[PDB]
Design a protein around this ligand. Structure first.
Ligand SMILES: NC(=O)c1ccc[n+]([C@@H]2O[C@H](COP(=O)([O-])OP(=O)(O)OC[C@H]3O[C@@H](n4cnc5c(N)ncnc54)[C@H](O)[C@@H]3O)[C@@H](O)[C@H]2O)c1
Ligand SMILES: CCCn1c(NCc2cccc(OC)c2O)nc2ccccc21
Ligand SMILES: [Cl-]
Ligand SMILES: [Cl-]
Ligand SMILES: [Cl-]
Ligand SMILES: [Cl-]
Ligand SMILES: [Yb+3]
Lengths: 494, 494, 494, 494
């Protein structure tokens, strides 16, 4: 069941968080934060810029110094601190999910039952790794003793998007901290509020000062200061392909800092004629419409074998027509607004491209409501590979359905994109499930499901959907720096 | 294609191999070795007993001493020696396969194309691991530096069976040597000859003396001396369940040496109605009839969904009727003899149990020929779970076919055995393949195939089919002893 | 600081724990449990025997069945249950440490600050592994998809000793449960009480019934029923070398169950002339006198370079003369009783052997007090390798100090034992620390410290000190059974 | 001993290698290749440019297609091909070492005994990993089966420097191929010749066409075409910090390809007063003077405790005065030329900076000879942290020796650089060796040695010395792309 907050939400944390203390901006400037369902201002927040990032990096550097509390404490104690943080987020789950829904335009049902649960579970998963990060002893040639340290890297700048503010915050800080790094986080200008509340809880949990610093502010200002900073060792980023390139270029130009990116997708589904049809329709629908289409792994190209294409389209239209738009905080509402005017415009323009380029509009196709950035859930049939709605990430509630009859050819079509984040395959045939999944150039492939993400799984893109992996055993590698220590000895023995 | 030896085989190596030199038995006694297809003596071999095992252990201990060549050489050089050994076995492939076929009663086609290839591939696989065996550096609580060494264990006694003499020899010595152990090998009394030729090649490859010692002889004599030896650190064994118990009891009684066993099976296949029927018939047939049924993983219980049972039986009988019995060295012969009189008697007695207990004899059922331990390939239909041919490992060319209609119940029947070595599942359904394979209590489960063994895969039994795993990454663990080194330091840093 | 329980301890849990319910013994029999510091009975406990073990195994088997809650719950939820159990033991830390001290004769300071802390930390460590136990995908030869499952083994029987009742309980159940096994635990007849209280907390934490079953009782009765049980898949044991052999023999005779043992030691220290002398004296003293000498890793042979031997002996005698004997619950008491009459007799007899065989008694040498199994802390100088106090594990407060001058020779002396659990090396020289530690045949080697045990480190014996490893990454391997699944596919791709 | 080629070297392979065939440049243009010891032209080579890189990428892409020989062959066969290549390089060791010495200006003794041996050993090491690259099976939340594939990435562009042509070639192609990638290699314009001979041997070994393509040519032309190519999935590079930035910027701008860099260093040694002084002098000398100073890990800042500084300097000057300059092919010659005029000028300019900025010139300081790019081996004493010879990588035979007295301060000085490739620590004290090595911000730290590189060790930079690691287990991660496959199932079981 679905509990709610019983007193109205009051916003408290609006300042920059450095050395576990709350800071005004060096400039004195603040910026507004809005509710996307009402277009009304919720509060003002201190606007971080290069001077504030500089303060946060110096604090993160000082907390990372050899001999510091965060460097010398037991690994197991880093893990305890992360488990306590998860306990505290659990405690404040009602408040955080409400704030997430109100600032982010996110259905409260999903914010409470999915986002917040995933934040808690991911933190507890990361806590468990902290004292299980291990190097190696190595039987090198010659009379030497050689071992490796999987050290933390150092100061990690972490630029977060607006579509999953808390979840991206925890996906970034959980592994970074578990491995022993210090972090400077720049949440989305649209959604700073839940991150600043979590900073409240980082202080309360007892993390040493400077281990986590949160600098709300804008992209070209505070984000770019992180990108180009000469004393940040690594930057991680989720967001647009265009910013990813600007960050990688900034990193190369300054100090050759390590960079990992996750950059969205144009993720395809392949539905074979032998698929459980209803199960395939339901998962592909959820794949593309989840959180108003504002998901990196949105299932935005659905290829269906011709034998079942018309039934698939018909059943998808029926399911898309069952939504209730409105304020994401009211029970029974099933689709909230898009995040802001930029994204709203982009979606409507792409919808229009679909009409003009010859797609078949099955439902939706326009905006909704007196206020709020609402888009009707929209389904296009007979989409072809050349159209803009087939090539460009939409990030809105807009489903594309295509037909195929040759399996060889539909795999090339699925792979014929610079994106590569995820894909889905729907079949009952063992051999097809394995060989299709092996052939798809995508970081996660779901078989007879879609959108299944868990802390135990590495997650990331092929090709221009990004580089590196997050979470799982494998994602922890990207938050360590390997040092080889080789000691001369008089005689080695196996 | 299938090349052959162009001059008749001459036997050269018949003595005990210790410190890379050839030894007469301390007693002076020798024992005969026979050809199972003719019942004729091939040669005499030095008979090892406790006094000879004692000599081999002392040499293996001396080669394992700290500061010795085998302990101090680079890991990568251990690997080079194993690759050279594989090169030499490749060179002598015609001779070894001929000797294997003549001493072991093994089809020459299979000895040359399967056994010898697997020996070569397994050695090269093991060679590659030698300098990739690694310990760990560990973020222990407190101000300490902690690392682990995955050392070799020490002197490993390795008791080999007669059904795959070369392959079992290499499965044992490949991982043992790669990890840095020294070994005392006791090949089957029935099949010492290929092992002694490989000892020729171990000397030729340059292995330091005492690293490999081979002591041909009998089980209750030389085998038991290994089992109960107070200076052997580990014993590995493949063979009967009954000897496994005698070895484990001997080990516990003497020096608590480490023990790994592989002990055969009563491995089941489950054939669902949606299976590729011909593919299932072919693989299950090969599973149970390979090497005259003398395989640990023989598919000796085949459960078939009632819908397809009668067709399955009919097609299996047709395939079983296509064999040519005779000397395993003549081209076109497709079934050789059983290994000796004990096994031959055991098979015929169990065949008779099948008749008397009410099984349906579809073909075969008796012996064959003027000489040689030949058994007609035999198929039983309508087998029930209580019969001896359903409960006891036969190790002969004897196939059991049963019907089921409830999948829940057939999984319990498949699992209702103290054996647990392997199993097979035949279905096109993804979900059934995964959930059935997960539910079966068996060390290897094949899906839509059977009998697929490779050096990259760990291999071993559940339950009384044995303990531990051989080959793969995982099997290397059982040839190392982990040492934790924990060093006090003034201050640790992550 | 050191808090205490403010009301006297009341014993509540005295029955057999099966399917999360409290059971009388099938026989109706109970047995007394005593306080070793007073020789007075504390309470009576239900006496488990073969019939009760049979009940516990059936429940553990049923909880392990495919489809059961414990088999189907998320791995991460197994970990949550273990973290909650740790939270509950933390809650009851005062009660548990008091009960541990009163039943076990264990200094309350140590029980509270060391045993209980280690129990809590070890559980939290094990919790973190639960959803990080992973198998492999393997690039086998041929057109196959091959993966491995690291399944739980099944029903694990766990026989616990009296010297560290809670810590051994958690060392056993933490990894077993994390990996997904079910357990039947048989605590020491002398110390059932803390285990039964923990069973209270396993129920309270929400573990499914039958996952943990605790059967207090005697060794030759309930212990032997576990050893020889035909439906227990694995047995783990810590205790005497003599029982280890009886367990391994019992396992071999019945169902070839997997066996891991830890069997004590005769662990040596090597003190070089360049060692920090005071640091070496302090750690070796603690090594041998900790918990009245009743530690598996007791530093019971201390070899000291002749240059510093007399100073080392003198300083060790001074430190041994500073103890206060008495009831382990009174503040300032620094040495408690031995556990029972058997151990007390054994210690006094061995002390007498030391006198008669010619050792130099420096202090102690006799019993103490009106009541309680107290032994004076005792130091022997000029010990030689032939004496009983040099060869036999004493398990009492009895220190042996020997001189050496040749480093080659003292390593052979240190290694000249069938034991092999641990060792210590004291030197400032890098090269000596590495090469000596590499040469010692011991499972853990401490350098410039002693007795440093942590959940992140694997722990176990070389040679007759046992087989397998506990805790660390590596120890988790011994609570899994590897299954290889190999799937035929039309075409594989790298 | 040191065998030599008995007939003069004849150059044969001068063309572009694509699809295992030899190609003229699209332009028809060729470029000269010189001997640095004589300044004479050795031959002309086809000049690759963007059009030729385009041809090589298309071939590498085609060889990487699903269903291709290189994608479908057994992993173990990829390893066989790499072992055969190593066998062939061994066969041609005399020719390759001669060609390496003549084109690269590299002492023939070192080319034959070190470079060529390292090439052979590294290939054999990489061969062994090929069928040991494994993914995972993962206990994800929910009723799913989740596994990972560690796939090859795809087409990898590999830009090689002139200082270790063969060794860098093999460090790049060995791991790339072992993991299953295809490669487009661009050797240094100064040293294409040994790479083109190895391409001869790749064809001879049987690698499928298009798996390895070698495009000799210039940096701003063919190198930049690789950097910015829209169908290259990854680029690896060793060379200058300045090009690294140009490559990272090019990659970000085009297709966000993965990038790993190794970019040289300013690697420091710390020599404590208790060090084995002669051992420290010898290793630091070799560290900075090896291959005429043209090593990434050159020990170009040597900090020595004041107590021993003057003796250290004196002994280093004595050892530096013992060199014989001349043609690297004549026996007994111990220092060859620098590679070309650019590097020669850079070294002399930096030497002059040392004089003018106030360093103490102890020996050398000018050029040498009638012809060839020879620099006198040069030692500077009393170097301070501000001078150019302390800050800038020299890549010439130029040693800097500084004094320290505070260990805290000398660690900050050692770390006060944007470089971070390697470091050395010389002490007998265990605690100092561990804590100093832990505090140094460097990818490899040697203790009481220097310059010890082996295939089993990961190798790479901290900070601006580069990103990622090469060789070892860990370096293989950077040649794979992880795919998560998550399959919906009816019910999971642990
Ligand atoms: N880390 C090393 O081992 C290493 C090796 C060589 C040079 N260096 C450093 O670089 C300094 C200058 O030497 P250099 O100019 O010969 O090195 P460089 O970086 O320019 O050349 C090395 C490789 O990079 C290529 N390259 C050059 N420009 C390129 C471009 N725009 N795009 C793509 N590839 C390009 C070159 O053709 C060559 O293959 C040296 O003095 C040294 O300090 C380091
Ligand atoms: C001062 C070291 C010279 N040196 C060598 N010598 C050849 C060599 C020898 C052994 C193993 C090798 O590969 C693992 C190998 O390449 N290779 C280097 C790579 C980078 C920096 C310096 C190098
Ligand atoms: Cl590593
Ligand atoms: Cl380990
Ligand atoms: Cl495995
Ligand atoms: Cl993975
Ligand atoms: Yb000149």
């Amino acid at each position: 069941d679905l509990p709610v907050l019983l007193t109205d939400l009051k916003i408290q944390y609006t300042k920059i968080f450095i050395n576990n203390e709350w800071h005004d901006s060096v400039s004195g400037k603040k910026f507004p934060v809005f509710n996307p369902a009402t277009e009304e201002e919720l509060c003002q927040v201190e606007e971080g810029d290069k001077e504030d990032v500089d303060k946060a990096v110096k604090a993160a550097r000082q907390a990372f110094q050899i001999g510091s509390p965060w460097r010398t404490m037991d690994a197991s104690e880093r893990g305890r601190l992360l488990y306590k943080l998860a306990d505290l987020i659990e405690r404040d789950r009602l408040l955080l999910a409400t704030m997430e829904s109100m600032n982010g335009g996110k259905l409260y049902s999903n914010a409470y039952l999915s986002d917040l649960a995933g934040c808690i579970k991911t933190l507890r998963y990361c806590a468990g790794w902290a004292d299980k990060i291990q190097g190696r002893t190595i039987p090198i040639d010659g009379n030497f003793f050689t071992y490796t340290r999987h050290e933390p890297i150092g100061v990690c700048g972490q630029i977060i998007p607006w579509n999953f503010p808390l979840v991206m915050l925890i996906w970034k800080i959980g592994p970074a901290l578990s491995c022993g790094n210090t972090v400077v986080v720049k949440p989305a200008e649209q959604t700073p509020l839940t991150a600043l509340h979590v900073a409240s809880l980082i202080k309360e949990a007892g993390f040493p000062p400077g281990v986590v610093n949160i600098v709300p502010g804008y992209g070209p200002t505070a984000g770019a200061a992180i990108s180009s900073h000469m004393d940040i060792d690594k930057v991680a980023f989720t967001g647009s392909t265009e910013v990813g390139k600007l960050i990688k270029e900034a990193a190369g130009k300054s100090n050759l800092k390590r960079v990992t990116l996750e950059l969205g997708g144009k993720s395809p589904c392949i539905v074979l004629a032998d698929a459980d049809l209803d199960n395939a329709v339901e998962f592909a629908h959820h794949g593309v419409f989840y959180h108003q289409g504002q998901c990196c792994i949105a299932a935005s190209r659905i290829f269906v074998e011709e034998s079942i294409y018309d039934e698939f389209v018909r059943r998808s239209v029926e399911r898309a027509k069952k939504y209730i738009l409105g304020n994401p905080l009211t029970p029974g509402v099933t689709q909230g607004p898009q995040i802001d005017k930029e994204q709203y415009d982009k979606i409507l323009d792409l919808i229009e491209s679909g009409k003009k380029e010859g797609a078949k509009l099955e439902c939706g196709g326009g905006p909704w409501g007196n206020k709020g950035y609402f888009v009707q859930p929209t389904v296009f049939s007979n989409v072809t590979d050349e159209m803009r709605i087939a090539k460009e990430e939409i990030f809105g509630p807009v489903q594309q359905i295509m037909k195929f009859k040759s399996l060889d050819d539909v795999i090339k079509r699925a792979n014929n994109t610079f994106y590569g984040l995820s894909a889905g395959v729907f079949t009952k045939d063992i051999d097809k499930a394995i060989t299709i999944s092996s052939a798809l150039q995508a970081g996660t492939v779901w078989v007879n499901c879609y959108g299944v993400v868990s802390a135990q799984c590495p997650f990331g893109g092929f090709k221009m959907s990004g580089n590196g992996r997050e979470l799982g055993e494998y994602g922890f590698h990207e938050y360590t720096e390997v040092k080889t220590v080789t000691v001369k000895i008089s005689q080695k023995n196996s």
